[PDB]
């Protein structure tokens, strides 16, 4: 809303944005992951102080160590202790949306479970609740085969990422296509 | 939301307009589009060449007059109340973004936000030769998805125009290939959001389960008609020509 | 064709603006047979060329 | 253009949504 | 919350709730009668393990009885009950088997599915090839340049 | 005699959406077009006259507006000979109106020669076409000739209809049926939906075959017949989908 | 079971009623063999005809 | 703008109408034209095929002579054939000294309404009408919440068929649809009771509409929240088949206001005509002898000439009981 | 294809002048030399329909599955009605007559069966209540149905829906009080009396010019039957009667009180049992109303529960409603 407009200061921008990038982890979220950090929030805010923590909190929405920040932890951070939850929320669906977003290409899905779910870094019987947790993740859909140790898995995956599915795009997309052409060869033709 | 009912009316008269007007890709021709613009359906009625002037060798200059429309609408309505202003077209086959300028001036004339008409003169690619739009905001505009309404009294002089399946694949590559350019386009034109807005859905593929069995299954059945499709080939056409042959063949008396 | 045409043929026919049945009354030697259209009332009215 | 003639066909009203009307004619 | 607990819910909790609440939470003779928080409890022991379920329900393909136990904290039986209950209930799909001690947790999978599934996966196009396509054009020309 | 009317297809469907709605009035106003050397009756467009109140009518031809748009229409780059009359003549064959003779025969003075456009906007809609021109004189002819200095010529006398446009709009117009991709296949690929039907359909062919076949023990309805014409739509219409997977 | 008044079946071995459930499909060669019964018979009985 | 609306809506022209004759398919439509014959016809948009049924009043096409709308029925002059009224004038208690219908009929009509555990098939009024009569059928529909619809009875059989039930069965469709609806059928010996001969006078018209509410009411159309009152002075003048239950769950007496019933109906019914305390109020209710809760107004209105006649819009003791002695005069 | 379409107008087929041809009617009452479908051929078409006819091109363009609701005015129409027998209880060896009468005869003959008695009181509910479990396509009648004053159409669907129910064949025909129609005209009986002339006469000729074959039985109410003809009682074609009792033995009563105060809120109070002995010699209905007359009577108390009393109430005051 002020991105068009509206000159500000750096007091003013920081500490919001500051409050902003704060407010992430108070948000903390529907993961972010990846965000607004993008947007000039950043340099501007971190940078320093908790700008360090919170941009190395980027890096928690991404690296997800406990003591790459648990270390990190002042009051501020840890006056909200759930965050150490949250991080175990990152570290799950942070290593989640990449698995999503890439492990299977093929029809991403499986997923499931176990080891994959530890493939989070994240424990067995986390996944026994963390991966468990669905929806009651805010987010996973499927459903269990506990037996196997498999996952059903459905979307609610969205990011914001790029490089990827670009090349793997157009290869089963050309793949058909082409061999289309083999019957798309005289059918209407011949 | 409204999205639009197109009248070919208008689409043919356009490009005569274009053609009348000998707008050439230096210009757009201009215009009115007519119909009524409440329902989540828009319609269009009709349209009408705004006479006009465009400049892009500097952008927001340009000539246009309202003043037509006024006593335009007032026939419209004489000829018309149903006329009332959808929103207005242009040549195209694109924007420039005195469009928006241009957009505004029908904001004072139109019940909604007005509606932008893209045209392609030379009808180039594909479906549509035409876009409309809706200003928005950052300023945003879209295009709602149109198309024809019945105007079958169109539809029948249109019969007088015109005179199974491979097709449908064609397309198959087309979109794929701009797409994985698109990326790399915009990759390495801004080397936006939206596309990952894509990338999600693009898992929805090898997505094929067992279920196929049920395609297999289903298509059995799909065959069982096969001795029947031509079964009565089999036994219609062969058996057809033993009772005319003979008869005939044979009839040969004197 | 032999349908084809056949078939379209039939559209021609298709296209009517009617037959009347009509109750013909009498003739005179007008060679208008004085006839009372079925709902209507009567016409003296020329006949078919061939009848 | 409009009026009128001498005479119309006079018809009668059912409803009176809030803009509608139905009426049947002399015509019937 | 547990309200909310229900969308989450676990039943390694209940008697972690059941210590988690009872100022008046579980421990109510207030305004109502349990004598016993039975009454709650008792009566919210299948009320959790009942909802449990629900998430339970939706979070299995399949399950052992086991896991179930595990996560129910409940014998077999209690389970097989509940399970019977829903069962009973059609309230919810399953797998008895004890022979399995396992929970498939019943797809009913003959709704032919790839009916819809590949209409839908058609559907994913049409709203994929379809949503995504008409941007993409329009998208870099949006913007042109 | 033989003579060679062009229309904007525009200005057609302008006239038929104009009469389409135009139920019950004749709808009236200008033809845009002229004429090229003889015999060419070219149309560009046409308009409404607005409502008459009054009525078709000599009268109720109003040419301001016409200037007013001919004007915005000169503006527009829009300009014709107004080239005659057309108008919506519900279950009218025959004849318009001595009057829109009359009407028109006050305008073709205008002309050389004008047109009254008959149009049932009812029989219009068939999906074929209804209509005509009439404008009742002649030069001589194709040169018709003698009940003209014979005096009293009164008749419907046609005029020849034709009409153009281009390939261009014909696209356009059959550009009426991203899209194919996203219109095609994909698209209708919907058919397992009624697998059951896309069965019980095929099913139901079997009995109704039999039965057919049996008669064979005259005319239609004949033992071998509607048996391929009924064994043979399930048959496509089940092969299409198999494109899908 | 027996009388398939339910869809199951009896583990021996195991000892247990083992799954089983409701369909089978939908009655459809069903449908068509009658024809592919029906067809020769009067056709043959045609095919003699001719001969 | 407003005339520019005119202007437009002189644009606007009229559009045909039909009640379908039936539906043949959801699309196809044998609609008799509301203006004419049969025509087969197809819907348009709007449309709902479902909605779509045979009687559904249709707008129609001029050309395309299919729906161009779906309409609201009136199949029936609801406020002349049948006359219809959302509830009544008064509630139970002003005509009270009638009291005995007052309440009993209020919970064999109105309670068992709202308390659905059978439901009241008829309601039968009898007695001299006026004493609070006429009054006490919309005394009950006042209470209910139904729309109380007033039903005469000659005017229900044309001499055709099923016009009585075509007139009934709207009492039966609108009302039904326009439930609560208390329906009342006036003193009906015409079109119901027992006739003539029980044979043809137009009698089998009559014994239709006879047995169109036997055939509406002992036949499975019920009174879910549209009550029927009937309307008798004497009830031994009607079918006793229709006194049966099934059709009759009710036969109401309705006796003249006693003296008090006058006392209570007369300190209603007059007292509330603006009076003087002067105004004499049980020596007219003394002198009033057999009043009914109107001829109890005539204390009043009788009085109002005295009272418009003595310069009073308060009626006033000389006003009162010129009245009343006026009103017992004609009669007792 | 598109030749045919939908803005099409009623007529009845006449008759084929030859293939794709013939006079018909409009509903205009035009008839005239017009084509037809060359979709149908012969055994395709249809000698007399109600038929589909462009307006100008004005010609066959299919025929009408057959038209029902004119006037006439209409049919009785309950398709699968919703009364279960044994809801007036007892009438087992009744309804096993109607059943012996109709729904064994729909089966395996009379072409018409007589319910006597009182409807309403039940009989009226044996007809639906067989007609529910018939399930043969129901058709009820009044004898009042067809009183306009017409000398005209009349008989028609009385015709073709008794033909449209042996289009329907299994269906059923009923009337409600066919004495109604059942009375004739005796002499010059001027307005009224000439349609069931036509109408009465037309069942007479129907019942006595139709074949055996039993799709659908011709039933038909009555309390009275002395309007009616032996034209109609002529055997092979009415040849059922059943005689609504009411009257009762006490077994039908217990199950008539079984009947209704099973579904009727009760008082302890409410004693069937005593009303077995309360109740002898009167009319299921008044006794079912009796049941509901205290179903009302504790609802018009506002008991909850409906008392013996409030039986009591209902019996003792319809004992003798004198």
Same mark, same amino acid.
């Given at each position: 809303?002020?991105?068009?407009?509206?000159?500000?200061?750096?007091?003013?921008?920081?500490?919001?944005?500051?409050?902003?990038?704060?407010?992430?982890?108070?948000?903390?979220?529907?993961?972010?992951?990846?965000?607004?950090?993008?947007?000039?929030?950043?340099?501007?805010?971190?940078?320093?102080?908790?700008?360090?923590?919170?941009?190395?909190?980027?890096?928690?929405?991404?690296?997800?160590?406990?003591?790459?920040?648990?270390?990190?932890?002042?009051?501020?951070?840890?006056?909200?202790?759930?965050?150490?939850?949250?991080?175990?929320?990152?570290?799950?669906?942070?290593?989640?949306?990449?698995?999503?977003?890439?492990?299977?290409?093929?029809?991403?899905?499986?997923?499931?479970?176990?080891?994959?779910?530890?493939?989070?870094?994240?424990?067995?019987?986390?996944?026994?609740?963390?991966?468990?947790?669905?929806?009651?993740?805010?987010?996973?859909?499927?459903?269990?085969?506990?037996?196997?140790?498999?996952?059903?898995?459905?979307?609610?995956?969205?990011?914001?990422?790029?490089?990827?599915?670009?090349?793997?795009?157009?290869?089963?997309?050309?793949?058909?296509?082409?061999?289309?052409?083999?019957?798309?060869?005289?059918?209407?033709?011949? | 939301?409204?999205?639009?009912?197109?009248?070919?009316?208008?689409?043919?008269?356009?490009?005569?307009?274009?053609?009348?007007?000998?707008?050439?890709?230096?210009?757009?021709?201009?215009?009115?589009?007519?119909?009524?613009?409440?329902?989540?359906?828009?319609?269009?009625?009709?349209?009408?060449?705004?006479?006009?002037?465009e400049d892009e060798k500097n952008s927001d200059v340009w000539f246009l007059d309202h003043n037509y429309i006024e006593n335009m609408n007032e026939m419209c309505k004489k000829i018309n109340a149903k006329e009332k202003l959808i929103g207005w077209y242009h040549s195209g086959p694109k924007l420039r973004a005195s469009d928006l300028k241009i957009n505004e001036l029908f904001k004072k004339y139109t019940?909604?936000?007005?509606?932008?008409?893209?045209?392609?003169?030379?009808?180039?690619?594909?479906?549509?030769?035409?876009?409309?739009?809706?200003?928005?905001?950052?300023?945003?505009?879209?295009?709602?998805?149109?198309?024809?309404?019945?105007?079958?009294?169109?539809?029948?002089?249109?019969?007088?125009?015109?005179?199974?399946?491979?097709?449908?694949?064609?397309?198959?590559?087309?979109?794929?290939?701009?797409?994985?350019?698109?990326?790399?386009?915009?990759?390495?034109?801004?080397?936006?959001?939206?596309?990952?807005?894509?990338?999600?859905?693009?898992?929805?593929?090898?997505?094929?389960?067992?279920?196929?069995?049920?395609?297999?299954?289903?298509?059995?059945?799909?065959?069982?008609?096969?001795?029947?499709?031509?079964?009565?080939?089999?036994?219609?056409?062969?058996?057809?020509?033993?009772?005319?042959?003979?008869?005939?063949?044979?009839?040969?008396?004197? | 064709?032999?349908?084809?045409?056949?078939?379209?043929?039939?559209?021609?026919?298709?296209?009517?603006?009617?037959?009347?049945?009509?109750?013909?009354?009498?003739?005179?030697?007008?060679?208008?047979?004085?006839?009372?259209?079925?709902?209507?009332?009567?016409?003296?009215?020329?006949?078919?060329?061939?009848? | 253009?409009?009026?009128?003639?001498?005479?119309?066909?006079?018809?009668?009203?059912?409803?009176?949504?809030?803009?509608?009307?139905?009426?049947?004619?002399?015509?019937? | 919350?547990?309200?909310?607990?229900?969308?989450?819910?676990?039943?390694?909790?209940?008697?972690?709730?059941?210590?988690?609440?009872?100022?008046?939470?579980?421990?109510?003779?207030?305004?109502?009668?349990?004598?016993?928080?039975?009454?709650?409890?008792?009566?919210?022991?299948?009320?959790?393990?009942?909802?449990?379920?629900?998430?339970?329900?939706?979070?299995?393909?399949?399950?052992?009885?086991?896991?179930?136990?595990?996560?129910?904290?409940?014998?077999?039986?209690?389970?097989?009950?509940?399970?019977?209950?829903?069962?009973?209930?059609?309230?919810?799909?399953?797998?008895?088997?004890?022979?399995?001690?396992?929970?498939?947790?019943?797809?009913?999978?003959?709704?032919?599915?790839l009916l819809n599934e590949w209409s839908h996966n058609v559907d994913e196009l049409l709203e994929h090839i379809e949503t995504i396509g008409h941007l993409i054009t329009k998208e870099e020309i949006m913007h042109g340049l | 005699t033989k003579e060679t009317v062009y229309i904007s297809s525009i200005a057609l469907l302008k006239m038929l959406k104009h009469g389409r709605a135009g139920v019950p009035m004749?709808?009236?106003?200008?033809?845009?077009?002229?004429?090229?050397?003889?015999?060419?009756?070219?149309?560009?467009?046409?308009?409404?006259?607005?409502?008459?109140?009054?009525?078709?009518?000599?009268?109720?031809?109003?040419?301001?507006?016409?200037?007013?748009?001919?004007?915005?229409?000169?503006?527009?780059?829009?300009?014709?000979?107004?080239?005659?009359?057309?108008?919506?003549?519900?279950?009218?064959?025959?004849?318009?109106?001595?009057?829109?003779?009359?009407?028109?025969?006050?305008?073709?003075?205008?002309?050389?020669?004008?047109?009254?456009?008959?149009?049932?906007?009812?029989?219009?809609?068939?999906?074929?076409?209804?209509?005509?021109?009439?404008?009742?004189?002649?030069?001589?002819?194709?040169?018709?000739?003698?009940?003209?200095?014979?005096?009293?010529?009164?008749?419907?006398?046609?005029?020849?209809?034709?009409?153009?446009?281009?390939?261009?709009?014909?696209?356009?117009?059959?550009?009426?049926?991203?899209?194919?991709?996203?219109?095609?296949?994909?698209?209708?690929?919907?058919?397992?939906?009624?697998?059951?039907?896309?069965?019980?359909?095929?099913?139901?062919?079997?009995?109704?075959?039999?039965?057919?076949?049996?008669?064979?023990?005259?005319?239609?309805?004949?033992?071998?017949?509607?048996?391929?014409?009924?064994?043979?739509?399930?048959?496509?219409?089940?092969?299409?989908?198999?494109?899908?997977? | 079971?027996?009388?398939?008044?339910?869809?199951?079946?009896?583990?021996?071995?195991?000892?247990?009623?083992?799954?089983?459930?409701?369909?089978?499909?939908?009655?459809?060669?069903?449908?068509?063999?009658?024809?592919?019964?029906?067809?020769?018979?009067?056709?043959?009985?045609?095919?003699?005809?001719?001969? | 703008?407003?005339?520019?609306?005119?202007?437009?809506?002189?644009?606007?022209?009229?559009?045909?109408?039909?009640?379908?004759?039936?539906?043949?398919?959801?699309?196809?439509?044998?609609?008799?034209?509301?203006?004419?014959?049969?025509?087969?016809?197809?819907?348009?948009?709007?449309?709902?095929?479902?909605?779509?049924?045979?009687?559904?009043?249709?707008?129609?096409?001029?050309?395309?002579?299919?729906?161009?709308?779906?309409?609201?029925?009136?199949?029936?002059?609801?406020?002349?054939?049948?006359?219809?009224?959302?509830?009544?004038?008064?509630?139970?208690?002003?005509?009270?000294?009638?009291?005995?219908?007052?309440?009993?009929?209020?919970?064999?009509?109105?309670?068992?309404?709202?308390?659905?555990?059978?439901?009241?098939?008829?309601?039968?009024?009898?007695?001299?009408?006026?004493?609070?009569?006429?009054?006490?059928?919309?005394?009950?529909?006042?209470?209910?919440?139904?729309?109380?619809?007033?039903?005469?009875?000659?005017?229900?059989?044309?001499?055709?068929?099923?016009?009585?039930?075509?007139?009934?069965?709207?009492?039966?469709?609108?009302?039904?649809?326009?439930?609560?609806?208390?329906?009342?059928?006036?003193?009906?010996?015409?079109?119901?009771?027992?006739?003539?001969?029980?044979?043809?006078?137009?009698?089998?018209?009559?014994?239709?509409?006879?047995?169109?509410?036997?055939?509406?009411?002992?036949?499975?159309?019920?009174?879910?929240?549209?009550?029927?009152?009937?309307?008798?002075?004497?009830?031994?003048?009607?079918?006793?088949?229709?006194?049966?239950?099934?059709?009759?769950?009710?036969?109401?007496?309705?006796?003249?206001?006693?003296?008090?019933?006058?006392?209570?109906?007369?300190?209603?019914?007059?007292?509330?005509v603006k009076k003087t305390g002067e105004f004499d109020f049980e020596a007219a209710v003394k002198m009033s002898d057999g009043f009914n809760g109107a001829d109890i107004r005539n204390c009043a209105t009788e009085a109002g000439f005295f009272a418009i006649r003595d310069d009073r819009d308060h009626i006033n003791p000389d006003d009162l009981m010129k009245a009343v002695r006026k009103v017992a005069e004609?009669?007792? | 294809?598109?030749?045919?379409?939908?803005?099409?107008?009623?007529?009845?087929?006449?008759?084929?002048?030859?293939?794709?041809?013939?006079?018909?009617?409009?509903?205009?009452?035009?008839?005239?030399?017009?084509?037809?479908?060359?979709?149908?051929?012969?055994?395709?078409?249809?000698?007399?329909?109600?038929?589909?006819?462009?307006?100008?091109?004005?010609?066959?363009?299919?025929?009408?599955?057959?038209?029902?609701?004119?006037?006439?005015?209409?049919?009785?129409?309950?398709?699968?009605?919703?009364?279960?027998?044994?809801?007036?209880?007892?009438?087992?060896?009744?309804?096993?007559?109607?059943?012996?009468?109709?729904?064994?005869?729909? @089966? =395996?003959?009379?072409?018409?069966? $007589? *319910?006597?008695?009182?409807? /309403?009181?039940?009989?009226?509910?044996? !007809? #639906?209540?067989?007609?529910?479990?018939?399930?043969?396509?129901?058709?009820?009648?009044?004898?009042?149905?067809?009183?306009?004053?017409?000398?005209?159409?009349?008989?028609?669907?009385?015709?073709?829906?008794?033909?449209?129910?042996?289009?329907?064949?299994?269906?059923?025909?009923?009337?409600?009080?066919?004495?109604?129609?059942?009375?004739?005209?005796?002499?010059?009986?001027?307005?009224?009396?000439?349609? @069931? =002339?036509?109408?009465?006469?037309? $069942? *007479?000729?129907?019942?006595? /010019?139709?074949?055996?074959?039993?799709? !659908? #039985?011709?039933?038909?109410?009555?309390?009275?039957?002395?309007?009616?003809?032996?034209?109609?009682?002529?055997?092979?074609?009415?040849?059922?009667?059943?005689?609504?009792?009411?009257?009762?033995?006490?077994?039908?009563?217990?199950?008539?009180?079984?009947?209704?105060?099973?579904?009727?809120?009760?008082?302890?109070?409410?004693?069937?049992?005593?009303?077995?002995?309360?109740?002898?010699?009167?009319?299921?209905?008044?006794?079912?109303?009796?049941?509901?007359?205290?179903?009302?009577?504790?609802?018009?108390?506002?008991?909850? !529960?409906?008392?013996?009393?409030?039986?009591?109430?209902?019996?003792?005051?319809?004992?003798?409603?004198?």
């Amino acid at each position: 809303t002020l991105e068009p407009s509206t000159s500000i200061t750096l007091a003013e921008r920081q500490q919001l944005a500051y409050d902003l990038s704060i407010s992430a982890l108070l948000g903390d979220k529907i993961y972010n992951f990846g965000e607004l950090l993008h947007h000039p929030i950043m340099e501007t805010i971190v940078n320093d102080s908790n700008y360090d923590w919170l941009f190395q909190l980027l890096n928690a929405l991404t690296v997800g160590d406990f003591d790459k920040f648990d270390s990190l932890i002042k009051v501020q951070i840890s006056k909200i202790p759930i965050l150490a939850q949250h991080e175990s929320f990152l570290r799950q669906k942070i290593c989640l949306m990449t698995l999503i977003e890439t492990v299977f290409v093929k029809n991403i899905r499986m997923l499931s479970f176990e080891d994959i779910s530890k493939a989070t870094h994240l424990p067995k019987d986390n996944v026994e609740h963390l991966v468990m947790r669905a929806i009651s993740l805010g987010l996973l859909k499927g459903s269990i085969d506990q037996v196997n140790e498999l996952v059903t898995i459905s979307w609610v995956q969205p990011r914001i990422i790029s490089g990827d599915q670009i090349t793997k795009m157009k290869d089963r997309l050309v793949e058909w296509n082409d061999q289309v052409e083999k019957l798309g060869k005289k059918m209407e033709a011949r | 939301h409204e999205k639009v009912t197109i009248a070919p009316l208008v689409l043919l008269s356009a490009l005569d307009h274009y053609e009348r007007t000998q707008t050439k890709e230096n210009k757009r021709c201009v215009g009115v589009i007519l119909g009524d613009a409440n329902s989540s359906t828009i319609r269009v009625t009709n349209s009408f060449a705004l006479p006009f002037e465009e400049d892009e060798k500097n952008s927001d200059v340009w000539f246009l007059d309202h003043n037509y429309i006024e006593n335009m609408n007032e026939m419209c309505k004489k000829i018309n109340a149903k006329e009332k202003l959808i929103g207005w077209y242009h040549s195209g086959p694109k924007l420039r973004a005195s469009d928006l300028k241009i957009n505004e001036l029908f904001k004072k004339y139109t019940q909604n936000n007005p509606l932008l008409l893209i045209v392609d003169v030379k009808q180039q690619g594909v479906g549509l030769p035409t876009d409309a739009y809706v200003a928005i905001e950052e300023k945003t505009f879209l295009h709602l998805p149109c198309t024809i309404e019945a105007e079958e009294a169109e539809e029948i002089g249109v019969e007088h125009l015109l005179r199974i399946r491979l097709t449908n694949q064609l397309k198959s590559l087309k979109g794929l290939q701009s797409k994985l350019k698109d990326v790399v386009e915009y990759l390495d034109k801004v080397i936006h959001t939206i596309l990952g807005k894509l990338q999600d859905v693009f898992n929805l593929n090898n997505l094929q389960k067992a279920l196929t069995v049920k395609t297999n299954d289903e298509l059995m059945v799909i065959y069982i008609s096969n001795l029947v499709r031509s079964i009565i080939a089999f036994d219609d056409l062969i058996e057809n020509k033993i009772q005319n042959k003979k008869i005939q063949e044979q009839r040969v008396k004197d | 064709n032999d349908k084809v045409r056949f078939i379209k043929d039939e559209l021609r026919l298709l296209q009517e603006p009617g037959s009347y049945v009509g109750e013909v009354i009498k003739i005179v030697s007008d060679k208008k047979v004085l006839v009372k259209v079925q709902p209507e009332g009567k016409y003296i009215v020329d006949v078919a060329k061939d009848i | 253009k409009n009026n009128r003639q001498l005479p119309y066909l006079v018809a009668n009203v059912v409803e009176v949504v809030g803009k509608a009307a139905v009426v049947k004619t002399s015509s019937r | 919350s547990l309200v909310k607990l229900f969308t989450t819910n676990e039943l390694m909790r209940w008697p972690i709730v059941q210590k988690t609440y009872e100022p008046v939470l579980n421990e109510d003779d207030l305004a109502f009668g349990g004598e016993a928080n039975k009454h709650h409890w008792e009566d919210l022991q299948k009320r959790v393990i009942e909802h449990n379920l629900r998430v339970i329900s939706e979070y299995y393909s399949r399950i052992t009885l086991l896991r179930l136990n595990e996560l129910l904290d409940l014998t077999e039986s209690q389970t097989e009950t509940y399970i019977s209950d829903l069962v009973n209930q059609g309230i919810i799909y399953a797998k008895v088997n004890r022979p399995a001690k396992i929970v498939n947790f019943e797809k009913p999978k003959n709704s032919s599915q790839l009916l819809n599934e590949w209409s839908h996966n058609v559907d994913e196009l049409l709203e994929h090839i379809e949503t995504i396509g008409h941007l993409i054009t329009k998208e870099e020309i949006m913007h042109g340049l | 005699t033989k003579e060679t009317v062009y229309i904007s297809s525009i200005a057609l469907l302008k006239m038929l959406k104009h009469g389409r709605a135009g139920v019950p009035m004749e709808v009236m106003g200008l033809m845009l077009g002229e004429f090229v050397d003889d015999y060419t009756v070219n149309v560009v467009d046409v308009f409404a006259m607005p409502q008459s109140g009054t009525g078709v009518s000599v009268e109720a031809v109003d040419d301001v507006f016409q200037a007013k748009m001919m004007d915005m229409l000169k503006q527009t780059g829009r300009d014709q000979m107004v080239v005659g009359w057309y108008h919506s003549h519900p279950g009218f064959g025959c004849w318009l109106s001595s009057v829109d003779v009359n009407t028109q025969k006050s305008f073709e003075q205008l002309n050389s020669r004008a047109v009254a456009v008959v149009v049932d906007p009812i029989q219009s809609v068939k999906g074929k076409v209804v209509i005509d021109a009439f404008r009742l004189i002649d030069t001589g002819a194709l040169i018709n000739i003698q009940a003209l200095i014979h005096g009293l010529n009164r008749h419907y006398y046609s005029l020849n209809i034709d009409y153009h446009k281009t390939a261009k709009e014909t696209k356009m117009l059959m550009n009426l049926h991203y899209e194919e991709k996203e219109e095609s296949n994909l698209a209708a690929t919907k058919s397992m939906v009624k697998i059951a039907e896309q069965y019980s359909k095929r099913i139901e062919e079997e009995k109704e075959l039999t039965e057919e076949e049996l008669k064979t023990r005259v005319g239609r309805q004949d033992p071998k017949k509607h048996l391929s014409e009924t064994a043979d739509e399930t048959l496509e219409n089940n092969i299409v989908s198999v494109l899908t997977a | 079971i027996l009388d398939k008044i339910f869809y199951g079946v009896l583990d021996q071995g195991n000892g247990w009623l083992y799954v089983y459930e409701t369909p089978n499909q939908d009655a459809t060669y069903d449908s068509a063999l009658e024809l592919v019964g029906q067809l020769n018979k009067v056709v043959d009985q045609l095919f003699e005809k001719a001969s | 703008d407003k005339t520019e609306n005119d202007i437009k809506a002189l644009q606007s022209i009229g559009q045909l109408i039909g009640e379908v004759m039936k539906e043949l398919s959801e699309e196809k439509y044998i609609v008799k034209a509301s203006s004419g014959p049969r025509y087969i016809v197809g819907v348009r948009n709007s449309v709902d095929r479902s909605k779509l049924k045979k009687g559904v009043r249709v707008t129609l096409d001029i050309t395309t002579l299919t729906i161009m709308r779906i309409l609201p029925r009136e199949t029936d002059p609801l406020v002349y054939n049948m006359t219809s009224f959302e509830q009544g004038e008064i509630t139970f208690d002003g005509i009270g000294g009638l009291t005995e219908q007052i309440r009993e009929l209020r919970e064999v009509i109105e309670l068992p309404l709202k308390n659905p555990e059978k439901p009241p098939k008829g309601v039968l009024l009898y007695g001299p009408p006026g004493t609070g009569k006429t009054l006490l059928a919309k005394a009950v529909a006042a209470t209910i919440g139904a729309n109380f619809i007033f039903s005469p009875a000659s005017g229900i059989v044309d001499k055709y068929i099923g016009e009585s039930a075509r007139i009934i069965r709207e009492m039966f469709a609108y009302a039904k649809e326009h439930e609560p609806c208390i329906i009342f059928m006036d003193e009906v010996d015409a079109i119901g009771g027992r006739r003539f001969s029980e044979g043809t006078s137009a009698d089998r018209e009559i014994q239709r509409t006879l047995m169109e509410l036997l055939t509406q009411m002992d036949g499975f159309d019920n009174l879910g929240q549209t009550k029927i009152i009937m309307a008798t002075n004497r009830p031994d003048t009607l079918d006793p088949a229709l006194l049966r239950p099934g059709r009759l769950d009710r036969k109401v007496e309705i006796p003249l206001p006693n003296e008090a019933g006058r006392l209570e109906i007369f300190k209603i019914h007059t007292a509330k005509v603006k009076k003087t305390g002067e105004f004499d109020f049980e020596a007219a209710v003394k002198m009033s002898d057999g009043f009914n809760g109107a001829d109890i107004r005539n204390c009043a209105t009788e009085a109002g000439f005295f009272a418009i006649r003595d310069d009073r819009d308060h009626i006033n003791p000389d006003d009162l009981m010129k009245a009343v002695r006026k009103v017992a005069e004609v009669k007792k | 294809k598109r030749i045919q379409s939908v803005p099409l107008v009623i007529g009845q087929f006449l008759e084929p002048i030859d293939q794709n041809t013939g006079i018909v009617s409009s509903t205009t009452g035009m008839s005239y030399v017009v084509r037809i479908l060359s979709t149908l051929d012969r055994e395709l078409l249809k000698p007399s329909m109600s038929v589909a006819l462009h307006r100008h091109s004005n010609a066959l363009v299919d025929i009408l599955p057959p038209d029902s609701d004119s006037s006439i005015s209409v049919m009785g129409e309950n398709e699968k009605p919703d009364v279960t027998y044994a809801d007036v209880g007892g009438l087992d060896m009744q309804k096993q007559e109607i059943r012996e009468a109709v729904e064994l005869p729909l @089966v =395996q003959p009379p072409r018409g069966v $007589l *319910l006597y008695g009182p409807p /309403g009181t039940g009989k009226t509910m044996l !007809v #639906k209540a067989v007609a529910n479990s018939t399930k043969a396509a129901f058709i009820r009648v009044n004898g009042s149905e067809f009183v306009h004053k017409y000398l005209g159409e009349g008989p028609r669907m009385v015709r073709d829906v008794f033909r449209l129910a042996r289009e329907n064949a299994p269906s059923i025909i009923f009337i409600d009080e066919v004495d109604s129609i059942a009375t004739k005209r005796f002499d010059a009986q001027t307005g009224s009396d000439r349609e @069931v =002339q036509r109408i009465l006469i037309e $069942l *007479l000729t129907q019942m006595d /010019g139709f074949d055996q074959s039993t799709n !659908v #039985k011709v039933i038909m109410a009555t309390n009275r039957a002395d309007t009616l003809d032996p034209a109609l009682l002529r055997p092979g074609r009415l040849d059922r009667k059943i005689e609504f009792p009411s009257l009762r033995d006490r077994r039908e009563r217990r199950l008539i009180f079984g009947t209704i105060a099973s579904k009727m809120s009760l008082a302890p109070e409410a004693d069937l049992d005593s009303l077995i002995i309360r109740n002898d010699s009167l009319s299921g209905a008044v006794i079912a109303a009796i049941m509901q007359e205290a179903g009302l009577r504790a609802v018009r108390k506002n008991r909850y !529960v409906i008392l013996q009393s409030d039986l009591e109430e209902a019996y003792a005051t319809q004992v003798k409603t004198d």
